[PDB]
Design a protein around this ligand. Structure first.
Ligand SMILES: Nc1ncnc2c1ncn2[C@@H]1O[C@H](COP(=O)(O)OP(=O)(O)NP(=O)(O)O)[C@@H](O)[C@H]1O
Ligand SMILES: [Mg+2]
Length: 419
């Protein structure tokens, strides 16, 4: 639920590319045509002011996905593209670079159009445009979003437009703010998020149908879900397709344990004995009340922990995650919802204060694999009722790797796991 907020949070805390060891699968529209992949930005002959912006942003080498996407997007005649790769692989930097290659800042009208699922996500993309194109003196950016106060009769002179589908459609047709036949590059970013809203699909297609045939069409998604793929086929005609499989999570270098408990207050005491061993840790709870209650009790017992709860704005969650990464916080308590799909790094211990279960009540094996884990990690699961023990064993059955019973009372066994 709310993929747009999860996506926004990952943007705010993302500091570098995610390392992927898989290979890029390329499906060109012409299977006879060769596969051209570059390994440096000089190989692309970018405009000097654009290469300057690329280097000024700390980029020195194309990312894995960019090695194939950049030469394909800069080829003549323009090639359309549907690209799929996990968050943090450089999809956004890729199409920003493509947009900045085709824009002529002397022509004071929109030439590149990008659709974002939300205003906040549009702002994140606009920041990348502002950075990479900061050596384009006359280059200006317009935000076609609901909050924009624009009186009729004006014709926007910004060369790049980022916006949400509803407002962009109004600007291109009804309100006559954009002439769509002058658009040279069209991007639909975060298609996996965009489809979460019913109206967005129809609006995005209607916008695309107004563009000229010589306009380059680009679509990017974090996931390869069939619904996104079917939507993408309706948006991008005659597409090349690029895919980078998500980096697998092995689970083999992590010691798993579970603690039988009589009640909740037992789980708190059992957690206290463990805390001595540690080595930042994340603690996952089902309800905000559990997370708030647990975070408070840990403070009373002499330890400061960061809390991740739903009343916090996305910007506050990012600030807490950043402090946790910088070591200022040694332990982070979070609900399942606030942590679902968030790429938190620098975690070596996971405490499943509550076992991850889907809305069907069954085990959430996907969430379990994502939280845990080639560096040694530790996973402690807190069982309470017999139901929870029935669940835990189903997890143990799923992965077929044993979760040894930890005896929280015995401090000697706690040192054994710490090894
Ligand atoms: N060629 C590059 N070299 C180094 N860092 C890069 C490069 N391209 C992008 N990055 C960085 O890698 C991170 C992810 O880049 P970004 O373009 O936002 O990825 P993404 O695939 O669009 N993410 P998402 O929109 O959440 O699916 C950011 O910190 C970028 O600054
Ligand atoms: Mg992206």
């Amino acid at each position: 639920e709310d993929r747009a907020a999860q996506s926004l949070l990952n943007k705010l805390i993302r500091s570098n590319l995610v390392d992927n060891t898989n290979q890029v699968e390329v499906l060109q529209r012409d299977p006879n045509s060769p596969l051209y992949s570059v390994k440096s930005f000089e190989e692309l002959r970018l405009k000097p002011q654009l290469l300057q912006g690329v280097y000024a942003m700390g980029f020195n080498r194309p990312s894995k996905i960019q090695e194939n996407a950049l030469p394909l997007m800069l080829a003549e005649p323009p090639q359309n593209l549907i690209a799929q790769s996990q968050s943090g692989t450089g999809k956004t930097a890729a199409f920003v670079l493509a947009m900045l290659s085709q824009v002529e800042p002397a022509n004071k009208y929109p030439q590149c159009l990008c659709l974002s699922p939300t205003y906040e996500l549009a702002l994140q993309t606009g920041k990348v445009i502002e950075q990479m194109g900061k050596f384009y003196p006359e280059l200006k950016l317009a935000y076609a979003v609901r909050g924009n106060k624009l009186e009729r009769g004006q014709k926007i002179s910004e060369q790049i437009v980022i916006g949400t589908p509803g407002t962009v459609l109004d600007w291109c047709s009804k309100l006559k703010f954009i002439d769509p036949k002058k658009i040279k590059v069209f991007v639909l970013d975060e298609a996996d998020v965009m489809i979460a809203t019913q109206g967005h699909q129809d609006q995005s297609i209607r916008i695309q149908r107004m563009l000229p045939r010589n306009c380059q069409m680009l679509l990017f998604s974090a996931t390869f879900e069939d619904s996104v793929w079917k939507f993408a086929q309706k948006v991008v005609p005659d597409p090349n397709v690029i895919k980078l499989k998500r980096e697998e999570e092995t689970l083999d270098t992590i010691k798993q344990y579970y603690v039988l408990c009589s009640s909740r207050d037992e789980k708190f005491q059992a957690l206290c004995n463990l805390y001595g061993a540690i080595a930042q840790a994340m603690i996952f709870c089902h309800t905000r009340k559990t997370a708030s209650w647990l975070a408070a009790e840990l403070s009373k017992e002499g330890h400061q922990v960061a809390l991740l709860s739903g009343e916090m704005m996305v910007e506050q969650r990012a600030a807490v995650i950043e402090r946790f990464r910088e070591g200022k916080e040694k332990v982070l308590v979070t609900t399942n919802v606030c942590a679902r799909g968030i790429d938190v790094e620098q975690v070596s211990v996971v405490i499943n204060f509550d076992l991850p279960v889907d809305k069907d009540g069954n085990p959430d094996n996907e969430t379990y694999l994502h939280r845990i884990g080639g560096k040694r990690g530790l996973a402690v699961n807190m069982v309470d009722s017999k139901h929870s023990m029935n669940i835990l064993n189903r997890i143990q059955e799923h992965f077929n790797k044993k979760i040894e019973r930890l005896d929280t009372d015995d401090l000697d066994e706690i040192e054994k796991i710490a090894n």
